[PDB]
C-alpha cells in the first residue's frame, strides 16, 4: 500500500489549499448537481422548508494529476480538508446542518486527469416566501439559491453537470411532505450583484401545492355545520323563546371560537386569507339568524306562524348554497 501513499504525498507536496485552481490564468468552473433524498415538511409559521440533499460539486484541478495503477482514488474524508474546495453557501438558507454521523458524510474521488468530485449530505432549512392571499388553495415556488461566497464571477462560475432539466433529481420514496405535494423541479442560472462584486447564483425553484384535506375537516366542514345548525332554528316554535335563543347564542360562540384556530394556524399576516373570507361570510349568515329571531320576538286567539320564518326557511339556505357555489368555484377551479 506504500505505492498509493507516495502518490497521495506527491499530490499534496507543495500544494497551497488557499488558492483556487488556476488563480491567474483561468476561471475555475464548478459542475453542480443535487440529488434530493427527502423533501421534508414545510413549516408555514416560519415560512421555511427542510430539504435533505446529496449536493455534488465537480471541478478541474491541474495540480492533482497522478500516474498510477488505479484510475480513480476513492479517498477518505481527511483528504478533503487538505485540498481546495469551493465555498458554496446557500443565499436563502437559515440553519443547515452538515451531517457527520458516524464519520463526516463527505466524498472525494480524484480521477487520473485531475477531475474531482465532492458529494455532501446536508439538511437545508431555506426561506420560502409565501403570499397567503389564496390560503388554503394556494401554490408556492419555494426556492433554493446556492453560489460562491468569496469568489466573484471572474474567478469561480457554476454550471450543471447534466442537462438542467435532469440536474436536480428527487427520489421517489423521498417525500416527507404531509401537507403539500411536489409538482416538479425547476432550475435557473443567473448573476447577482452585491457590495463586493457580481456573483454567479444558481436558483432551484421547487413548485408546491397545498392539499385541502386538513382544513376541509377542521374549518370548512364545522363552519358549514355551524351555519346549518343555525338554519334549523327557523323551523322552531315561534313561542319557544329560550330554545331559539340558545340555538343562536351557541351558534355565535361556535362561530367565533372556530375562527380562532384559523389565525392560530397561519402566521400573523396583515391581509385576509380566503378562509378568513369564508369565516366572515359564514359569520354573517349565522349572526343574521339572531337578527331574524329578534325581529320575530319583537313582532310576536292563538299565535300564527311568522311570515319571516317562512321566508327564512327558504331564502337563507339557498343564499348559503349560492355563496358556496361562487366561492368554491372561484377559488378551487381558478
Amino acid at each position, epitope marked *: 500500500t506504500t505505492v498509493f501513499t507516495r502518490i497521495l504525498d506527491r499530490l499534496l507536496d507543495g500544494y497551497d489549499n488557499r488558492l483556487r485552481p488556476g488563480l491567474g490564468e483561468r476561471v475555475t468552473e464548478v459542475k453542480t448537481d443535487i440529488f434530493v433524498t427527502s423533501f421534508g415538511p414545510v413549516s408555514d409559521h416560519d415560512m421555511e422548508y427542510t430539504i435533505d440533499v446529496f449536493f455534488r460539486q465537480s471541478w478541474k484541478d491541474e495540480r492533482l494529476k497522478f500516474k498510477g495503477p488505479m484510475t480513480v482514488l476513492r479517498l477518505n474524508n481527511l483528504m478533503a480538508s487538505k485540498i481546495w474546495t469551493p465555498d458554496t453557501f446557500f443565499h436563502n438558507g437559515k440553519k443547515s446542518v452538515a451531517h457527520n454521523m458516524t464519520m463526516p458524510n463527505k466524498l472525494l474521488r480524484i480521477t487520473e486527469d485531475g477531475t474531482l468530485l465532492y458529494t455532501m449530505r446536508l439538511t437545508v432549512r431555506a426561506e420560502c416566501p409565501m403570499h397567503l392571499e389564496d390560503f388554503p388553495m394556494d401554490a408556492h415556488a419555494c426556492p433554493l439559491k446556492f453560489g460562491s461566497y468569496a469568489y466573484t464571477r471572474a474567478e469561480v462560475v457554476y454550471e450543471w453537470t447534466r*442537462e*438542467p432539466a435532469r440536474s436536480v433529481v428527487v427520489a421517489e420514496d423521498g417525500s416527507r411532505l404531509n401537507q403539500y405535494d411536489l409538482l416538479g423541479q425547476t432550475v435557473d*442560472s443567473g448573476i447577482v450583484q452585491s457590495s463586493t462584486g457580481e456573483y454567479v447564483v444558481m436558483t432551484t425553484h421547487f413548485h408546491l401545492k397545498r392539499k385541502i384535506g386538513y382544513f376541509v375537516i377542521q374549518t370548512y366542514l364545522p363552519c358549514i355545520m355551524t351555519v346549518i345548525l343555525s338554519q334549523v332554528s327557523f323551523w322552531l316554535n315561534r313561542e319557544s323563546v329560550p330554545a331559539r335563543t340558545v340555538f343562536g347564542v351557541t351558534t355565535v360562540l361556535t362561530m367565533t371560537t372556530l375562527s380562532i384556530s384559523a389565525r392560530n394556524s397561519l402566521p400573523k399576516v396583515a391581509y385576509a386569507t380566503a378562509m378568513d373570507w369564508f369565516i366572515a361570510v359564514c359569520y354573517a349568515f349565522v349572526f343574521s339568524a339572531l337578527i331574524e329571531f329578534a325581529t320575530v320576538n319583537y313582532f310576536t286567539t292563538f299565535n300564527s306562524v311568522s311570515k319571516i320564518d317562512r321566508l327564512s326557511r327558504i331564502a337563507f339556505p339557498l343564499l348559503f348554497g349560492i355563496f358556496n357555489l361562487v366561492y368554491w368555484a372561484t377559488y378551487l377551479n381558478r
Partner: antibody
Amino acid sequence: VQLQQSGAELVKPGASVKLSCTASGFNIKDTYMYWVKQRPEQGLEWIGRIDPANGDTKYDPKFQGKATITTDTFSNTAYLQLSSLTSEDTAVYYCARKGLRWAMDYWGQGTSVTVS
Amino acid sequence: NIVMTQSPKSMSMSVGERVTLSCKASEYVGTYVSWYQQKPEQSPKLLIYGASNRYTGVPDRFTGSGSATDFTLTIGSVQAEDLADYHCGQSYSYPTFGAGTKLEL
C-alpha cells in the same frame, strides 16, 4: 480551438457512410460533443449527444437506431455512423462543442452528404 | 419535447434602423436560449448565450433580452454585412432549434 471535419461524401442510398470530425486545442473529455443536421433551406436539427468521459450517449427519438455516435481518447476524435441512407438524409452535418451555459460554442466547417 | 416557434420567416428593411426578433417557447426554458447567425455557405457562429450575454467579438449593436418563456433579440442600426439568417435554440432540456429568421433588403 479549431474543429476540423472530414470531406463531402456521395454514396448510394441504402448504404452506410463513416463521418468524423477532429477537435484540436483542447480535450473532448471535459465538454460534451453535439451533432446537428442542417437541411438546405431549412432549420437546424439536433442529432444526438455523447459524453466522451463517461461514454454515455443520448439521441433524438426520430434519429434513434439509424444514427449513433462513437469516440476515442488517444486521437481526440468524434465519429458518426449512418445507416440506411435515404433522400431526406441529404443535408450538411456539424459537430458542436458544449460551451459556456450550454450554448454550442464551436462549430465545424461542415460535411455535405448526398445520395443518388 | 421543447418546441421553438420563432417568428417571422424573414424581414426586408434597409440599413440603419432598429429591427427586433422573437422566440417563443412551448414549455419553460429558464434563461438558456442561444442565438446564432447563418450566412450563405457558412457555418453558424455564436452570438448570445444565457438570456442576454454578449459573446466575445459580438458588436454592441446586438442586444438580447430574456424571460421565463418569451425571448427576443433587438438589432440597433443593422448594416449590410449583417444580412444573414438567425437561429434561436434552447438547452434547458435536450437541445432543439427554431425554423430560422432571415433578413432582406
